[PDB]
């Protein structure tokens, strides 16, 4: 997969913005996915339970 | 022939149990039997009774004339309990 190209102005017209620099110094770090997207997935289970997962 | 060593080992124990019941072993003194320490037992014996005994004197009291003869016979190939016995 090609890495995202550097853009003169962020956010990108679609709306993509790379992770903010400097990274936060919190004890917990959330890395981006291989697709350079936030690792948040909406999920529904049992046909009635809505869920969201951070991986 | 049934396979397995546990079954063969189990039967050997089964045979031993029957043999022991038929022919109980002759009694033997705990001194000869394993896990015996005369010095440790005497200390425990005195503490168990909650009484103070002089180790040397108590051993002499335990010492008997017959015991000395056996040791002397082995020695050929010591204070008796008579004095304490009278008191």
């Amino acid at each position: 997969i090609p890495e995202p190209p550097k853009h003169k102005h962020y956010p990108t017209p679609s709306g993509w913005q790379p992770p903010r620099d400097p990274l936060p110094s919190l004890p917990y770090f959330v890395r981006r996915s291989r697709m350079h997207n936030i690792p948040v997935y909406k999920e529904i289970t049992h046909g009635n339970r809505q869920m969201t997962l951070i991986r | 022939v049934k396979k397995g060593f546990r079954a063969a080992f189990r039967f050997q124990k089964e045979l031993e149990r029957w043999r022991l019941l038929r022919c109980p072993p002759p009694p033997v003194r705990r001194s000869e039997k394993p896990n015996w320490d005369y010095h440790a037992e005497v200390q425990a014996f005195g503490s168990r009774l909650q009484e103070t005994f002089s180790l040397d004197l108590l051993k002499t009291a335990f010492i008997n004339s017959c015991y000395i003869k056996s040791e002397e016979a082995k020695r050929q190939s010591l204070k008796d309990n008579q004095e304490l016995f009278e008191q």
């Binding site: 997969i1 990274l23 770090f29 890395r31 291989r34 | -």
Partner: protein
Amino acid sequence: DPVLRKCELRIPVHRRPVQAWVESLRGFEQERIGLAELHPDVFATAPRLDIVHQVAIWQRNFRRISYANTKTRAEVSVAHGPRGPTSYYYMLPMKVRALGLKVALTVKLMQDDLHIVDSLELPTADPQYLTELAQYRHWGSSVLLVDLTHEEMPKNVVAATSGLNSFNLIPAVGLNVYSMLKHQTLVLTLPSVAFLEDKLLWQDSRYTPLYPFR
């Protein structure tokens, strides 16, 4: 002069590099000669032993073939007896197997069972030297030696390892979880680590294949 190694691939900024003592087998006292950096995404993965446990089961079971057979009542000239050759073959995804290998590498390093070496070359071919050296460095009773490629592995090491049952010599492509677990300590050449890292790090952007990669 310390031997300094850096990860060829880009280490994450938020992740610090993993480091270990570079060693050489040339001499008994050559325990530490350099400092090397190891990719956190490879050598600092979470210790997921169930994946390792699954891989070990897969390793034992995908080769499992039972040849037991018996004649049933209809075939008598057993109600539920073995019926001919039976196999248990199944395949784990390459992502899981690579992850399982990644997990195993971290455990050995963290448990001080992994020894990174520059090369396998030995001053002598005597098997005694290798066993004594393992005792000298307090290695486990079983030591696994890995080289970059089978063809180029030194002759001296071959003789020492070939004659030793508990010391097994394998190429880089021959690495597997079962051997690592069976062997108390692992000895890896520096080129092999890069070779393993490349394949393990290749999993990045794992295009689902419509045909073989070749």
